[PDB]
């Protein structure tokens, strides 16, 4: 029920949103893995540009 | 519950006085209202145009706008726990100059005049209206006639 004064809100939480939740606790590990793969490819292509 | 009609319960308030029906005297039409006069409201049922609502009957307001036939006036109305100064338009028949202000104006002129006077004389004069003071001592002279006795009268039935 509306209080005295405020904004009308439409939260989009009428589905089973708690089953589909993407936590980001693997973000630093993902960054580390991407780095390691990047340096591995850079070593693999010996004199070639690393960027491509 | 009651009815919300605009003229409910006004059969005596908006009626005309006894032996005073008929043509409105023209002096009411021939008065001048300027901006800022204190004025009284008294609904007259003879004319129905521009009749004020019954809740302003007997109220005193201040003129803020003058128009061909009517006058706009600011008047206070007590609504529940608050008072609103609201402005209404009333035709000139239902209106009348308030004499509560002219007394104060005349008093202002008169005490200003007596303040201007005696300023050179240096004497003291009272201007503030003091309340009715207690009666001072005096003598009551009997003229040789003694006051007469007063006694209650005996009970005796009339009806």
């Amino acid at each position: 029920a509306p209080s005295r004064n405020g904004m009308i809100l439409k939260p989009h939480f009428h589905k089973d949103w708690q089953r589909r939740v993407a936590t980001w606790f693997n973000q630093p590990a993902r960054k580390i893995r991407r780095r390691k793969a990047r340096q591995a490819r850079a070593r693999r292509i010996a004199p070639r540009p690393a960027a491509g | 519950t009651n009815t919300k009609g605009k003229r409910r319960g006004t059969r005596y308030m908006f009626s005309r006085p006894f032996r005073k029906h008929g043509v409105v005297p023209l002096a009411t039409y021939m008065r001048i209202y300027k901006k800022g006069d204190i004025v009284d409201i008294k609904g007259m049922g003879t004319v129905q145009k521009g009749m004020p609502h019954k809740c302003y009957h007997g109220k005193t307001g201040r003129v803020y706008n003058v128009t061909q036939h009517a006058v706009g006036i600011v008047v206070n109305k007590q609504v529940k726990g608050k008072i609103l100064a609201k402005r209404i338009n009333v035709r000139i028949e239902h209106i009348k100059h308030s004499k509560s202000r002219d007394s104060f104006l005349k008093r202002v002129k008169e005490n200003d005049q007596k303040k201007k006077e005696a300023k050179e004389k240096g004497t003291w004069v009272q201007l503030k209206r003091q309340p009715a003071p207690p009666r001072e001592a005096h003598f009551v002279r009997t003229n040789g006639k003694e006051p007469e006795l007063l006694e209650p009268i005996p009970y005796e039935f009339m009806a």
Binding site: N5, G6, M7, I8, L9 | -
Partner: protein
Amino acid sequence: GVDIRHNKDRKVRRKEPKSQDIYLRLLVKLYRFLARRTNSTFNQVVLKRLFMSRTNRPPLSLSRMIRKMKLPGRENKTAVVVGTVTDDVRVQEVPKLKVCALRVTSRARSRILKAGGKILTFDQLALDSPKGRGTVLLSGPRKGREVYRHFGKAPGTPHSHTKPYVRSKGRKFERARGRRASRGYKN
């Protein structure tokens, strides 16, 4: 039994800053002493404004300060503001001013120093003028915050130019029923 009411018995004004930093509290000590051992009320006003909160100490712009100090009579006096002096970019000519404030924007300080004025802090102000003679006490626009556009007489009510709370501005957001004579009513 005494026929009294205790509703408004306790006054709500601030006795001390709600902040916890130490520099402001040292300033408060100094100006407390100055206010209670000096008859000048400038110290009292400054101490009271030191007590106040952030939203009650709005920033003062360079344009405002120069505008209020260019008025006749107040030449070569020190402009005192208890807030923050922020730079105004839509002003080219800046005179030399003697400013005192708790904190000054870097660009504003550069502008004043280049123009030739000097920046003072409330400490050195105490040393220069304990009772504060030759001071022009200014303040930023307190009603400048946008929250004040939502306050007052409610919208959707005649003769009320109050901003509503809308999540997005557009033609589909609070424009149809109470805002048009064509659809229902117009307030």
